[PDB]
Amino acid sequence: KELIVYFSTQSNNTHRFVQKLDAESIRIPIDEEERIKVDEDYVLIVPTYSGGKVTDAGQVDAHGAVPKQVIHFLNDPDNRKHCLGVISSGNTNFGDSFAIAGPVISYKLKVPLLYQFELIGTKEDVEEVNRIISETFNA
């Protein structure tokens, strides 16, 4: 019963990475008027959209790190209880805001941050996420 739940904007970077992985996947809809209902365990794979904001204070502002559609998904407690762990993506050029949707979701759900990657991923990323998902569903 290996399953991925993922979100991807119109640019479809996260979509293309997930389509290279071995496990079955379900897409969280872009349209904010649509929701999905998941009744099986999944690893969550999402990109980051904080845009490298900083507060008045001076720390990383994580507002909008997690796409609104992913919050709506996780707000349904039936969806939320089935998350085994989170894999986040982005671009290291966002510096201290790189892939921070992962830490945010990990904190909110109390689930492991399993992996971080960039854009559509490399061969190495596919191989590593394939192994990590398997081990997440085994242990």
Partner: protein, 313 residues
């Protein structure tokens, strides 16, 4: 429907005078990705005056004349590439836009890359002598290896092939400056010029979106071409990147001669070459080994790489 029987002014100006002009419509948006990018780059507006680099004077003064010269040369070289992108590259993208908002976003890009160029001046004003500044300008003008790189890209901006222009527009912020951006991260990993690298981080926060956006618009246009022309465009991308990687390596081996940084800087360059390809929708052929840099340097770019209201719950 007014939109389908009218053209944007820039379409009217350069391509089609047969139809009347429509004002930009920000109320009925064709592509939400345009609104996402517009809101972020405008909300991320910054000026280099608001990062004071006078706190870099102690670490700067501890560098010998050779290292000071290397920094001034590297940064004056980056200033040239930003000058190319601000005055030619990003403004050339406006007329080839798929959407109205894209026309305004590229006007933002052209301005903000001008701010990038201007920020090196702010660093020089604080740290450099008049002689160090002028020597760096002479060195940039007289450096053929340096000059070869922008000279290869500019023709795509002034020619009539909008897709090749778009690839060049992605390659500049996606690849060509990272060989130079290695240096400030190398130094700030040793506690040297820490405020200067805050300016670099604000520049990268802009350039990462510029690369993404030009890559995203490239993909929407090629997806409509025949499989044969899609294959031709892919070959062109890989052939151009090969040529640009060649020119960059020649340049960085000269730039970093006697400093021993060329090896690491080139691996940082190829790391970014790989991200350029991915944001065009092509797989990176570079190994993790091939694009590896020292952990302490990478942590200066992103510590998150790892020691060095709608929520209902």
């Amino acid at each position: 429907n007014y939109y389908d029987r009218s053209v944007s002014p820039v379409e009217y100006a350069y391509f089609d005078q047969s139809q009347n002009m429509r004002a930009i419509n920000w109320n009925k948006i064709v592509d939400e990705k345009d609104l996402e990018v517009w809101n972020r780059v405008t909300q991320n507006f910054w000026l280099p005056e608001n990062i004071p680099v006078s706190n870099d004077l102690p670490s700067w003064n501890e560098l010998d004349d050779d290292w000071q010269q290397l920094i001034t040369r590297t940064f004056t070289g980056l200033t040239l590439l930003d000058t190319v992108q601000s005055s030619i590259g990003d403004v050339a993208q406006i007329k080839n836009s798929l959407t109205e908002q894209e026309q305004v976003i590229y006007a933002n890009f052209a301005f903000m890359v001008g701010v990038h160029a201007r920020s090196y001046g702010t660093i020089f004003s604080t740290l450099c002598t008049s002689e160090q500044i002028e020597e760096a300008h002479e060195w940039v003008v007289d450096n053929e290896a340096l000059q070869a790189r922008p000279k290869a890209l500019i023709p795509f901006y002034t020619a009539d092939d909008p897709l090749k222009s778009k690839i060049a527009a992605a390659l500049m912020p996606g690849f060509l400056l990272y060989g130079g951006f290695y240096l400030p991260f190398y130094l700030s990993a040793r506690g040297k010029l820490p405020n200067t690298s805050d300016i670099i981080r604000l520049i990268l926060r802009d350039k990462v979106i510029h690369n993404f956006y030009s890559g995203y618009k490239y993909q929407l246009k090629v997806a409509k071409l025949s499989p044969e022309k899609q294959a031709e465009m892919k070959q062109f991308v890989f052939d151009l990147l090969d040529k640009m990687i060649g020119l960059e390596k020649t340049y960085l081996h000269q730039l970093y001669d006697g400093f021993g940084l060329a090896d690491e800087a080139i691996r940082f360059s190829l790391y970014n070459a790989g991200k350029f390809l991915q944001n065009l929708g092509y797989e990176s052929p570079f190994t993790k080994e091939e694009t590896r840099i020292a952990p302490e340097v990478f942590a200066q770019l992103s510590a998150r790489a790892d020691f060095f209201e709608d929520w209902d719950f």
